[PDB]
Structures are given as C-alpha cells and as structure tokens.
Paper text:
Binder H33 is a small protein binder engineered by ribosome display to bind human interleukin 10.
The root mean square deviation calculated on 128 Cα atoms is lower than 1.2 Å. This high solvent content is present in <2% of the crystal structures in the PDB. The solvent content is probably responsible for the low diffraction quality of the crystals. The molecules in the crystal of binder H33 are arranged in tubules perpendicular to the z axis of the crystal lattice.
Residue numbers in the entry: 12 to 146
The structure:
Amino acid sequence: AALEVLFQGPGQPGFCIKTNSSEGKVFINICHSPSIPPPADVTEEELLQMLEEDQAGFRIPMSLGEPHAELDAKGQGCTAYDVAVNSDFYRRMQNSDFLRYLVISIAASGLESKYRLSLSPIWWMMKNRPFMGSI
C-alpha cells in the first residue's frame, strides 16, 4: 500500500513516531515535500469503502528513507527512518486522526517490507521533538 518514491530532499520535518523492532527502538520521521505526489483525492466515505474492498487498497506515495543510526534519551543506539509524503496530504493528515494513523501504519508496513523488520503496533508520537536525528 506504500508506493515508494525515490526522493533526494531533505523535505520539511513533520512529526516523529517512536516504536520498536524485535531488535531495538525505531523512530519514524514523517516528513513532507511538495515534490512527493499526493495519493488519490477521495472523500472519507470513498476511502472507507476502499479499505473494506481491499485492506491495503488506498495507495499512498511516500519515500522510505535509508536507516540512520541515532542515540535515544538513555544513550543507546537505535534506528531512525525518514518517510516523506506530499505536503498538502500532510496538512490533511494533521486534521484527521484516523487518516494520520493510517499513513503511519502504511509507512511502518512499508519499512517492514523494505528493510525486513517487524515493528510494534504500540507506537507513540514524540511531543517535544518533530524529528529524531539531524537537519
């Protein structure tokens, strides 16, 4: 359901999701750029039907950035991934909890497939820092 887009960037930092793999803490940096294509423009109703017909039927263009190592708040090594979506789509995400969660699920599953990982469903949004890593 993630449609991967190779994008240089940087794009603009957005927010940062803390989860964990079978091997350590993982951070997903949700970023955005105009350069990334938006997904289909669809209404809430249309979207909910698609997810009924096909669980992964709403495809979202996003970059799936290469792993970058970082240190957590207790000085241990961990991985971060930068995932960028379209900037207008980003603004829609900010105004809808279910849409934003859907994107994060699709990103997490995208990274799982690409980097052969398993990620915890129990993630949390980091409240002070929009981005884990440098920029």
